[PDB]
Amino acid sequence: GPVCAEASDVYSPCMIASTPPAPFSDVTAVTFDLINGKITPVGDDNWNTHIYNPPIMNVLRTAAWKSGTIHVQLNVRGAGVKRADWDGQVFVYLRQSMNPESYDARTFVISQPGSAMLNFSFDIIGPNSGFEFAESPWANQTTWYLECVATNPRQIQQFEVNMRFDPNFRVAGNILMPPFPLSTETPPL
């Protein structure tokens, strides 16, 4: 900055996770299963989570075998907190598995006050002619999780994971999913 680059593309919002309400001050985290569309908060912290249903998410949930790059944009709001009093940071971690033994594939570290953005990507690639069935016992294939940590949940209000397929993306096969409930984005007045 101060002059920006140029964002261009259509990224659809998949998964929001609002942070637990007052007086909960302790450090906390959440995990977005990027492929299977699930949001498991750590411990017994009452995060307020929603999974929306844009076409990207419906494909990622129903498609069995997947291949190629998906671009993510993690947005962070944002409580109305005086800039000089801000001490909140956000550590994120891409992971293959959610087991203790597995390592991170990427770490990011953000301490921008109020709000932040974080574009990254990663290639789903798998054994079966370049395709990956997420979490299949076959070949011990695994997903991609996105562990995210709010060091100060009083100041960080919510995470938000937007996604987009690169044009190289390819799926095959169907999974029988249950009926998806109609959760809608409550836009801010």
Binding site: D9, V10, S12, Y52, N53, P54, P55, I56, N58, V59, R61, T62, A63, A64, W65, S67, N128, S129, F131, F133, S136, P137, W138, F165, P167, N168, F169, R170, V171, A172, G173, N174, I175, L176, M177, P178, P179, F180, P181, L182, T184
Partner: protein, 368 residues
């Protein structure tokens, strides 16, 4: 006499092959209840659990052959008197997630046969259980959790005297396993879908029966405060607008005794019921014989001016909805000596010369 054992042909990695006798690997016994309803799971098990407790010629070859380049043929030898009829649908899906929907809509995508026992003595169809490669194995499909599902989409129009059984014969034929892979090219020559456009009930009588199925197919099919999803239907909703030659496959689900003549046409939602000039539009008449059960409507590029939207807002009424519908109109009247509705199942097989425009942000809902 002695021989060198290392150099024998015991590392034979051939696929399973031979006649249909020597490639059979399981038979399965489905029970059809005397009084079964629509949307009714008859069988639902993993495709590898089919082969448990079996002793056919290729059963041990199937389990132990590391690679199989051939497709799986399944044939179903179920029959019933022409008097009655129903519609069964066997269907293979690459996996599951807990508490799943078994609505015909959800299932049919991917690989399926649909048949009416009343008309067709038997019905066979081949498929590849690994949809993104030339090969597969028994160990692949056991751990991948490939799921076979038989469903009754329309009940018996006239119930049989006793319960019935459908014998499925699982074999391995010697066709090449070709993969079906969806991708984000804007222009594609053949985008298969197997999208269940809907079951059309027409009651017996005299009234103007008209049924609209919207061609804004994307964003799933409805439920309670919920919606269902195939992959291919979710895939087409990646794009905002689209067009192409649409290849429907309309199927009889009632018995041969319930007779009716059906006009199909493309047209827009504003047209009311009790508008008596549907045959001004270009249309296609569909009479079924006793034996015929299946008929393919195609609608060329001259039926559509522009592309239309994949999804529409749920709250748009028929009055202000500028995407095309597929009308299905009774040309005469639904008749028969026996009581029962004239059921009819439409299935968008695929779009030829598909052209997908733009990039859908998405809508969230289903019907229009």
């Amino acid at each position: 006499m002695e021989q060198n054992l290392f150099a024998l042909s015991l590392d034979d990695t051939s696929s399973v092959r031979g006649s249909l006798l020597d490639t059979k690997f399981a038979q399965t016994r489905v029970l059809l209840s005397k009084a079964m309803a629509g949307g009714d799971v008859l069988l639902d098990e993993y495709l590898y659990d089919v082969v448990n407790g079996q002793d056919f010629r290729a059963t041990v070859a199937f389990l132990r052959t590391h690679v199989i380049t051939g497709k799986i043929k399944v044939t179903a030898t179920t029959n019933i008197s022409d008097n009655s009829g129903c519609c069964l649908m066997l269907a293979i899906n690459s996996g599951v997630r807990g508490k799943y929907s078994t609505d015909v809509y959800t299932i049919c995508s991917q690989d399926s046969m649909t048949w009416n026992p009343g008309c067709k003595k038997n019905f066979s169809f081949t498929f590849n259980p690994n949809p993104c490669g030339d090969s597969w194995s028994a160990e692949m499909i056991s751990r991948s959790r490939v799921r076979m599902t038989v469903i009754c989409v329309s009940g018996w129009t006239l119930s049989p005297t006793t319960d019935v059984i459908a014998k499925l014969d699982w074999s391995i034929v010697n066709e090449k396993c070709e993969p079906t892979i969806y991708h984000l090219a804007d222009c594609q020559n053949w985008l298969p879908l197997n999208r269940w456009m809907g079951k059309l009930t027409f009651p017996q009588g005299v009234t103007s029966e008209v049924r609209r199925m919207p061609l804004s197919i994307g964003g799933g099919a409805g439920a309670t405060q919920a919606f269902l999803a195939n992959m291919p239907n979710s895939w087409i909703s990646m794009w905002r607008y689209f067009r192409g030659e649409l290849h429907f496959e309309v199927t009889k689900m009632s018995s041969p005794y319930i007779k009716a003549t059906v006009t199909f046409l493309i047209a827009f939602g504003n047209l009311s019921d009790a508008f008596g000039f549907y045959e001004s539009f270009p249309h296609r008449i569909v009479q079924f014989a006793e034996v015929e059960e299946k008929c393919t409507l195609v609608f060329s590029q001259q039926e559509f001016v522009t592309a239309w939207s994949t999804q529409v807002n749920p709250r748009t009424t028929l009055e202000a909805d500028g995407c095309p519908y597929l009308y299905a109109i009774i040309h005469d009247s639904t008749t028969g000596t026996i009581s029962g509705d004239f059921n009819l199942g439409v299935k968008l097989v695929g779009i030829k010369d598909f052209c997908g425009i733009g990039s859908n942000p998405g809508i969230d809902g289903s019907r229009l």
